[PDB]
């Protein structure tokens, strides 16, 4: 729960006690009883519906704001799920925060920059969704995808912008 938690944060490994994840937004509206809690949020066209073990706390009844990657089963959020849940920008703000929190506990205090560098490095690669020159499902650096679009649009005529998917 000290150094190990830090490891789990930098290694992006699956959290110790997973606590599910939220996908879409709308008004928080969860069910009540049943083994499978029959959540039903809202928004436009969508809804909600999950499935976790018995022991779990919610912290939010039917009323307010659900958003993406919120307290569901209250605990260690999965960075991998949160990446597709909220986006690359949010993850960078999450990891650094909890990492630094751990160091804050044991009285040693380092600037956030140092952490921010590493966490930025854990987000350089992205997996291919749409092919045009190389293959899909391919691990690749984001900045390398910069020249793809930049050169094919500003200098070339190949209007097949390959869609990349953020990869943690």
Please state, in angstroms and rounded to a whole number, the distance separating the CA atoms of residues 8 and 4: 6
What resolution in angstroms, rounded to 1 decimal?
4.3
Q: Name which of 138, 137, 127, 140 is nearest 166 in CA terms.
A: 127
Q: Which two tokens stand for residue 139?
A: 């691990």
Exposed/middle/buried for 77, CB within 10 Å: 0-12, 13-18, 19+?
buried
What DSSP assignment string belongs to the chain? --HHHHHHHHTTPPPSSB-----S-SB-----STTTT-----SSS--------S-------SSSB--SS--SS-SB--HHHHHHHT-HHHHHHHHHHHHHHHHHHTT----HHHHHHHHHHTTSEEEESS-SSS-SS-EEEHHHHHHHHHHHHHT--------EEE--
Name residue 8's beta-bridge partners. none
């Amino acid at each position: 729960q000290g150094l190990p938690r830090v490891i789990e944060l930098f290694e992006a490994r699956r959290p110790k006690a997973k606590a599910v994840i939220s996908e879409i937004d709308g008004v928080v509206r969860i069910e009540e009883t049943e083994e499978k809690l029959s959540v039903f949020v809202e928004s436009e066209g969508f809804s909600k519906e999950y499935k976790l073990p018995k022991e779990a706390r919610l912290l939010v009844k039917d009323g307010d704001y659900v958003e993406a990657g919120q307290p569901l089963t209250r605990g260690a959020i999965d960075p991998h799920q949160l990446l597709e849940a909220k986006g690359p920008e949010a993850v960078e703000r999450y990891l650094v925060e909890e990492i630094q929190k751990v160091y804050r506990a044991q009285g040693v205090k380092l600037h956030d920059k140092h952490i921010e560098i590493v966490v930025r490095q854990m987000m350089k690669y992205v997996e291919v969704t749409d092919p045009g020159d190389s293959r899909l499902l391919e691990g690749q650096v984001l900045e390398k995808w910069d020249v793809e679009a930049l050169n094919e649009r500003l200098i070339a005529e190949g209007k097949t912008p390959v869609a990349w998917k953020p990869l943690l």
